[model samples]
Structure formats: structure tokens, C-alpha cells
Target: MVDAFLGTWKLVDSKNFDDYMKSLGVGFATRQVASMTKPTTIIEKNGDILTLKTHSTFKNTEISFKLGVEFDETTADDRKVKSIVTLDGGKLVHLQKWDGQETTLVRELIDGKLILTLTHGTAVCTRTYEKEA
Candidate 1:
């Protein structure tokens, strides 16, 4: 069976997050607050649907989707867009598009840790999360 990201995970480390935020055009004040926020992520699968939720002191974001189906999404930054998700091997690939701009997020289970790779244009950020016992 393929690795399943179906658990609660706590953020442990992140890299180049600020650059990623800048690429998204997030304001300086908001970016500063986001930089220090550690978030917990939960992934669940129910039948043909998958739900991903994130919680942090600063804010929370969640989305539920079926593979290959596009749906409306409101991002943590409050941007309205269309999003779709698909699984390539064991990696979960998410794509978001808005106003001619698009971003990608890839999540994978690796070595008992959850790795989230965020990409926007030329900026990339990696966030690592450890599973909660």
C-alpha cells in the first residue's frame, strides 16, 4: 500500500517561508505574524474524499476535495481561487489558480514525518511536521 497521510502532525521546522509569502504578495505585517506561527495539520480520508485541516494560533485553514475534481477554495490569506488535488505515487499534489497566477503544494509522508513543499513562481518553501503520538 502507498503511504497515507492520515494523522495529526505538529510543525517542527520550516525553510524559506518568508520568500514564499513574498511571492504570494502577502503584506509585511501579515508575513511577520505568520513567520512565528507553528501549525498543526490533520489529514483524513473518507471513502473517495480527502480533507486537510490546519490550525495555528494566528489562523486556520481547511479544505475537502475529491481527487481530480476542481473546487472553490478560500486560502488562509483570504484569496478566493480554484483548487484541485491529485496523488502522484505517494505524493499529494495540490494546485491553486487565481487571476492568472497559480501555486502548487506537495505533501508527502517521509521517514515518519510529513513534508510540505510550497511553490509560487520561483519561490519555494519546505515545512516539516512530526506525527503526533
Candidate 2:
């Protein structure tokens, strides 16, 4: 079992998100909207089932998956692939494989902030989000 990751988070700052999108071959207009959107994420957990609801002005994305279980996922950018989630310490790591590429996303709570680390190909990005009460 991991620590509490259920709550709402507001995106505050990000680094290298644009390049990270490029690795996924996202369109210029969509990536432009995606790279800078400060979305709010709502996390819900029930036993082994976890749900992530991301809300923003441009769009909203949601996913529900179980720990250590592999399932099909269609990303906000419309990429579909298999995804597996694992919880370790205070981090929930999600691994996605598609388009002959793999990406790892780590979500963790640190110093009262939600930190998201995304890596694909040679592009890596870090997003910092503040928790909303």
C-alpha cells in the first residue's frame, strides 16, 4: 500500500513539456495547447483501482486502472497503448509502450506538491503541481 495520493492538484510549472510532446508526434496546435495548459487533476483510489481525472480549459482526460495490471489506454493526445501502473514508496509509476517508443511517468508527492516526471525517447519533462484543498 502507498501513501495518500487522492486529492486535487493544480499544475504550476513545467519544463521540457514541448519537446516531450514532439517525441509523441503531437500536432503543433494540439501540442501548443497541451504544453502550456495548467490542468487540475483529481485522483481517486479504491482498494487497487485508481483513477486520474485531469481537467483543463482545453480538454479533460481521465483514466482508471488497477495496480500492477496491464490495460489498454488512450492518451489525451489520442495515442493508444498498453499501460501498467505500479506503486513504490510515494511514487506511482506508469509505463506506456507505443509507436516503437516507451514512456515512463512518475507521479509523487513531495514537499506538499505533486511532481510529475515524464520521459520518452531522449526527451524528459518535469511538471510541478500544487495541491488544492
Candidate 3:
């Protein structure tokens, strides 16, 4: 099920990311650094565990979990969240909650490209990733 998304992807394009970070209460300086980052995303699945990793010059982060399971997560911006990921209709949907705020990230593979849609409140950011190969 998750095999379709298992691969290394390079960031190609991003849109409206600033507003998305603002909605998350990320500081201005951090947002400035985050905006210029070109990150690589890697997805790995072994048995019942799936790990999603992001690597960049600014920071590197990883999250490992089983589908439909909730776990504690510390986000890249240093926010502690209750995170869960699920596969729905061939799409990987990740949800994070902290305080009274939440964010949703939907990852889909289309035309051999990885499309990541991030949503926080009224702000939405779309990031496109191409296969490394």
C-alpha cells in the first residue's frame, strides 16, 4: 500500500509556504531560513513500520510510525505535537495537533512526482518533489 511512495524525492517547487509557516506561529527568522531550503524526502517501509525522512542544509528530520497510529512528535520548528499518519485512497495523510492548533499534510504520488499539500487553518502550501532518479 505504501510502496508507491517509497523512494527518494528532491524538492522542485513550492508555493504559499510563507503563509503556511505563519499559521503555525513560526518565527520570522526561522521562516526566512525555511523558505530558502531545498530538502530531500525519503520514504521507507519495512514490515509494519514506515519512516519518512527529510534532509536539507537547514535541518534534517525523520518520523517513523505505523499506519493509523498516533505518537508524540517534535516538529522541525520545535513544536511538540500529537501526530498520526494514515493512508486513504492511495494518499498518505499526516495530521499533527498541538495546543488548539493543527496541521494536515497530504502526500500523493502523481505522474511519478511527489505532491505534498500542507494545510494549517486557512493557509495552504503546496510543495512538488521529483524522483531522485
Candidate 4:
């Protein structure tokens, strides 16, 4: 059986998030606040469809999509942006399209860490995750 990967994961700790945000062009103020946030990740999988919800006291973001299919995503901050997330090699890969540009983000699990990689315009940012339960 495949790993369920369905659970509520909390933010135990993080490293290089500031640098990741900087590489993504996130402003200093946003980075400062975002870095301190302890976001809760809730994932639910039904057949080939997956839903991910990320909640925090400051922001709440949710995404729903099916495996091997592309879907649109809008950032929580109402940036009016668009993105597509798909599954590649058991890893969740996202292609964000905004302002005529495309950014790619890959999500994978390694060494008990949920690794998130954001690539755009010659920059790559990586974020790690720890399980809560």
C-alpha cells in the first residue's frame, strides 16, 4: 500500500525559511511575519484526489486537486495569481503562473521532513516540514 500521507502536521521548527522567502522575492515585512508563523497542515486523500489545507492565525490557505491533473491556485493574500499543481514521481509539483512568468514548486518527503522547493527566475527556495501526529 502507498503511504497515506494524510494527517495534521504542525510546525515544529524550520531553517533557511528566511533565505527561501528572500529567494522568492517576498518582502522583508512579509518574511518576518511569515517566518514566525506556525502553520497547521491538514491533508486528505480520496482516491486520486487530494486536498491540502494550511491554516494559521494570520493566514489560511487550501488547495484541492487530482493526481496527474493540473489545477489553478490563488495565493491566500489575494495576489490574483494563478498556479498549477500536479503529481510527479510521488512528489507534488506546482507550476505557478503569474504576470507572464511561471514558477515551479516541488513537494517531497525526505528524512522525516516535508521538503518544499520553489524555483523561479533563476532562484530556488526550499522549505522543510515536520509531522505533528
Candidate 5:
């Protein structure tokens, strides 16, 4: 069986990643470091279970979830918590649960490009990604 979502995707290009990190309240130094780091996304899916591992020279993060289930997510920067992601029509919809409010993030692919949309408080940021060999 061929899993459409199974593969290792490297961040060859990005747009507005710094802005997204800033919107997430990341510190200036951390944001600078993260912006320069290229993270590789390793996705493994078996049946309905999905595991996504993001590896970088500076940081590493992993997320596991079922197709319809909700789970908690903690950022590598240790700034956010309890973010739930659900798969919807081949796109990953993330709902960030915070202290008093919630944020929403959406991950989708468009024309072979990875797009990430983040909305927190009153800020909206978008980031793009490219696959690698």
C-alpha cells in the first residue's frame, strides 16, 4: 500500500516562518535560530494512526494522533501547550488550547507546496514549505 502522507519532507523553502514564530510569542533569539534552521518532517502512517517527527539541528518535535481524535501538543520552544490537531480532507486542522483563549492552525498542501496558517489572538501568520529529496 502506498501512503500518500508517508515520506520525509525537508524544508527547502519557507515564507513568513519568522512572523509565525513571533506571533507565537517566541523570543527574538529563539526566533532567529529557528528561522535559520531547516527542519525535516518525517511522517509515518499506519492505518489511522499518524506520527509526524520534525527534526532539526537545533530542535526536534514529534506529534502523534489518530485521524479523528484530539491530542495535546507542546512546542519545541516550550511556549504552547495542549494543541489538538484533526485531519480534514487531507489537511491537518490544529486547534490550540491556551489559558483563556484558543488558536487555530491549518496545514495543507497546495500545488506541491506546504502551507501553514496560524491564527492566534488577533494575529494571523502564514508559512510555506517545500519538499526535498
Candidate 6:
């Protein structure tokens, strides 16, 4: 399901990430620091499983899942979630459900690079990544 996104990516820019974190119930102190850090993400796929690793100065997070399988996960912001991933053509669709919130995350290739669209409530964060050569 995922082939075009099989590469390491560097975070180049973000917009309204702090708002996104706020929507995730992030604390003020964490939000202040989280907005200032740039993270790199690497995506790998083998057979039916895809591994997504995110590296950040704050806290690194790694998530691995097979298509259509639901798994329990704890986000960096301390949110306990049950998440599932499915690939829909160009976009890798992730649906996360927690106690009081739900987010739809979409990762897709655009303009030869990777772009992440994370949405929760009225907050939508747009983060762009460049493939590492």
C-alpha cells in the first residue's frame, strides 16, 4: 500500500503545530517547547507492516502497524489512543481515537516531498518534510 513514501524525511517547516498540540491536550510548558523543535521521520515498509519513526529533541516516537489492524498507543503528549492505519491510494490514513478526542492524520507525497496533515477539533497542523538523499 505504501511505496512512494518509503524514505527518510527531514522536517523543514510547520504551521500551527502549537495549536495542534493544544487540541491534543498538551500542557503549556510542553507546548512551548514542542513548537520549537524540528523532527525527522522515517517510514519503512515490509510486506504488510509499515514502521514510522519520528525523531525529536523532546521525545522520539515510533509506531508500527499492519494495515487495517488496530493497536493501542501512547502519544508523546501522554494521550492513550487506539489507532488504525489504512493506505488509500496516495495517502496513508491514520485514525486515532482517545478518551475525549479523535484525530485524522494524513501523510502523503506532494511535490516530491512528504507532507503531514494532522487534524484534531478545529486545529489542523501542516508539516512539510524533504526526502533525505
Give the candidate number with the greatest TM-score: 3
Local distance difference test scores for all models: 0.89, 0.86, 0.90, 0.70, 0.72, 0.86
Give the root-mean-square deviation of each candidate in angstroms.
1.4, 1.4, 1.1, 2.5, 2.6, 1.4
lDDT value for model 3: 0.90
Ranking under TM-score, best-scoring first? Answer: 3, 1, 6, 2, 5, 4
lDDT of 5 by residue, 1-133 (tens): 3255577777766666667677677899888877898788877886777887888888877777776566666666564567666777888787877688677778788877777787777677666667665
> How far is 100's C-alpha from truth in model 4 (Å)?
2.9
The residue-by-residue lDDT of candidate 4 on 1-133, one tens digit each, is 3354677777666656676567556788887777788888887787877787888876787788866565556674344556666666768777777777677768777877777777766666666667776
Alpha carbon deviation, residue 39, candidate 2 (Å): 0.4
TM-score for candidate 1, residues paired by index? 0.93
**Residue ranges of candidate 3 with Cα displaced over 4 Å:** none
Q: What is the lDDT of candidate 4?
A: 0.70
- Give the winner by lDDT: 3
Clashes found in each candidate (C-alpha, N, C closer than 3 A): 0, 0, 0, 0, 0, 0
lDDT of 2: 0.86
- Ten residues in a row with the worst lDDT in model 5? 1-10
Residue 39, model 5: Cα distance from true site in angstroms: 1.4
Instruction: Kindly list the per-residue Cα lDDT of model 3 for residues 1-133, writing each as its tens digit.
Output: 5677988999999999899988878999999987899999999888999998989988888878999889998887788899999999988999999899899999988888889999999999999999865
Candidate 6 lDDT tens digits, 1-133 = 4578887898999898888877777899989877888888889887877898888887787788999999998877667899999978889899999877699989988898788999998889999999885
- CA lDDT of 24 in candidate 5? 71
Model 2 ranges off by over 4 Å: none
Which residue ranges in model 4 land beyond 4 Å of their true spot? 1-4, 19-25
Give the number of colliding residue pairs in candidate 4.
Answer: 0
Looking at model 3, report the run of 10 residues with the lowest lDDT sum: 1-10
Among residues 3 or more apart in sequence or in different chains, the pairs in candidate 4 whose N, CA or C atoms overlap within 3 Å are none
Give the lowest summed-lDDT range of ten residues in model 1: 1-10
